[PDB]
Write a protein that binds this ligand. Structure first.
Ligand SMILES: Nc1ncnc2c1ncn2[C@@H]1O[C@H](CSCC[C@H](N)C(=O)O)[C@@H](O)[C@H]1O
Length: 568
DNA sequence: TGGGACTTTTTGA
DNA sequence: TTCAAAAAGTCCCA
């Protein structure tokens, strides 16, 4: 028997990293391909419909299409005599199965000419006369005028973010795919739209994509399109598990249909242990039914713009917290992203760097990283930011410009606002407002394994890897920073935030304002005790010679208080 | 070479 | 004028 994943693996090894990233050339492993193909084609009635059109618009070398060929050959061979009796007796013979499949059943598209030729040769070599016409298109699937729809669509689209995509192509996507593609969206949104649009009535689509669109702000329109145009049959969420070897992406498998049905429920399989060697096991189907995965059902008609895919216990937990809390962080706080210098090496220096003797302390700010943020407090800053925006006189401070900032001048000149003349070559790209940072505030890392909200007492500045917020004046008498960090750092709120948080990679969640500011908060009779416990924790943490042991006990007591307050 | 600590600036709006 | 989102992440080693 043939190894359908050998020539494709060799072609993958031939390419380098840049050409892979520019076109998203990362082929799917055999276990996922087997699961998707057998999920779509296990129950096909080949006698009822012996002309199923099965498409992969990103076929590549044909990881999906060769397995599809094998499944189709078995299907036809098992019912050849029934097909012979029901239809033309001379057309339906075993020796004619091959020519039939390639003529009517397998369709592939890809921009990669060499991959198309390799797949064509692989399809031809499935059998050892007239040259059979193989339905392989070398084209941009997002520009191709498709002349007919398809019974089944399987595959893996390219993933290209908003930085790696060309300007003109992005303009085309915004003009023609505006239903799913805006702002910081991804190309696989457009591939989702194209797959849905050319799926026949009653057809089935099943693809593996990144999982980020399930929760991300950019995926809202795509989620609406999917919810309103297809019936989502199944969502397999791998969370931070590594499905693609040596690839830093988080994957989900999605199966949907356009069948006219009153059924509106979705099977959701969510992995429970992200430390799993998926390729070690024989099938994905056995893994889904094991204890490594949990299964629940979600009513698609009950999906809002946010898809909250949790089991009944977590849904009850989330609903209790939502109903009890009358305020959100957005209601009471002002949030902002950190400084974006545009070139950190030019403006960020070690606080022991000798070059800081050239810079007057009026221009120097304390600089912290995401790892400097712990629970309730921030580590002492190790770095200084040169707030070069306040260097108005270019004639003076020429030592600073020539010996520190100018060492990267060329790179500083390639920033967007310098090319347009908005910024001077030595200025910060996005210097924000100094007064927002130089005050008591709360800071949290932009990516973390857990809630880490700290009170900043030292007017620390930061890059965009740290987000900040401060309480509005009108809400200062109702909420204090100590109480806020007390409740936000609790295990209750850790779980509550992770209910809807954007899962990025293994043990990493996105902590961005678009979801952090939606966290709801409460105040009740337990306010004083929670605030007092938080202040005790802060006092213990700030002592130079101290042990963190009692902090855990205080945290347990505070978690008990919060659970009592929220009735969970 | 797979697992863990850590996270820049480009970009549309 | 100036906000904030975005992992086919990056990068190192035992
Ligand atoms: N605009 C476009 N139209 C069609 N195919 C494209 C495309 N942009 C990228 N591709 C192709 O999409 C493929 C994604 S890699 C996945 C290949 C295959 N489906 C598998 O799972 O193994 C790449 O081979 C790339 O060449």
């Amino acid at each position: 028997s043939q190894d359908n994943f050998l020539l494709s693996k060799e072609y993958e090894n031939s390419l380098d990293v840049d050409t892979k990233k520019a076109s998203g050339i990362y082929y799917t492993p055999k276990i996922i391909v087997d699961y998707i193909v057998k999920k779509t084609l296990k129950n096909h009635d080949i006698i009822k419909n012996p002309y199923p059109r099965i498409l992969d618009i990103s076929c590549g070398c044909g990881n999906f299409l060769l397995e599809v060929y094998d499944i189709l050959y078995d299907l036809f061979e098992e019912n050849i005599y029934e097909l012979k009796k029901k239809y033309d007796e001379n057309y339906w013979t075993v020796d004619n199965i091959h020519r039939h499949i390639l003529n009517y059943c397998i369709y592939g598209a890809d921009i990669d000419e060499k991959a198309i030729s390799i797949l064509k040769d692989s399809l031809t070599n499935k059998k050892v006369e007239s040259d059979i016409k193989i339905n392989l298109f070398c084209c941009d699937s997002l520009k191709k005028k498709w002349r007919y729809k398809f019974d089944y669509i399987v595959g893996n689209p390219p993933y290209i973010g908003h930085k790696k995509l060309e300007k003109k192509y992005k303009k085309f996507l915004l003009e023609k795919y505006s239903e799913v593609y805006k702002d910081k969206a991804d190309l696989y949104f457009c591939f989702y739209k194209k797959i849905i649009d050319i799926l026949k009535q009653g057809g089935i689509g099943s693809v593996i994509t990144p999982r980020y669109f399930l929760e991300s702000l950019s995926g809202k329109d795509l989620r609406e399109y999917i919810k309103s145009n297809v019936n989502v049959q199944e969502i397999v969420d791998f969370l931070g598990a590594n499905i693609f070897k040596n690839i830093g992406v988080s994957s989900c498998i999605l199966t949907f249909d356009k069948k006219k049905t009153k059924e509106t429920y979705i099977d959701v399989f969510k992995i429970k242990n992200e430390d799993i060697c998926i390729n070690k096991f024989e099938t994905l189907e056995e893994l889904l039914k094991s204890s490594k995965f949990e299964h629940f059902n979600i009513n698609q008609r009950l999906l809002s713009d946010e898809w909250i895919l949790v089991n009944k216990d977590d849904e009850t937990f989330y609903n209790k917290i939502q109903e009890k809390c009358k305020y959100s962080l957005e209601d009471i706080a002002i949030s902002f992203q950190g400084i974006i210098t545009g070139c950190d090496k030019a403006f960020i220096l070690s606080k022991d760097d000798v070059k800081l003797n050239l810079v007057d302390d009026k221009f120097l700010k304390c600089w912290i990283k995401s790892k400097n943020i712990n629970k309730y407090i921030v580590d002492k800053s190790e770095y200084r930011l040169i707030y070069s925006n306040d260097i108005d006189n270019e004639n003076t401070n020429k030592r600073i410009l020539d010996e520190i900032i100018g060492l990267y001048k060329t790179k500083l000149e390639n920033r967007r606002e310098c090319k347009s003349g908005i910024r001077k070559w030595y200025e910060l790209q996005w210097g924000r407002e100094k007064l927002f940072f130089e005050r008591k505030k709360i800071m949290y890392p932009y990516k973390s394994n857990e809630n880490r909200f700290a009170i900043d007492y030292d007017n620390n500045f930061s890059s965009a890897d740290v987000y900040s917020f401060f309480i509005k004046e009108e809400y200062l008498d109702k909420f204090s920073y100590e109480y806020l960090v007390g409740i936000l750092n609790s295990s209750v709120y850790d779980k509550y935030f992770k209910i809807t948080a954007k899962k990025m990679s293994k043990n990493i969640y996105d902590y961005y304002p678009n979801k952090v500011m939606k966290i709801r908060i409460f105040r009740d009779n337990n306010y004083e005790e929670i605030e007092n416990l938080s202040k005790q924790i802060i006092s213990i943490l700030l002592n130079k010679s101290i042990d963190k042991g009692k902090v855990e006990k205080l945290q347990i007591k505070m978690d008990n208080l919060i659970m009592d307050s929220l009735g969970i």
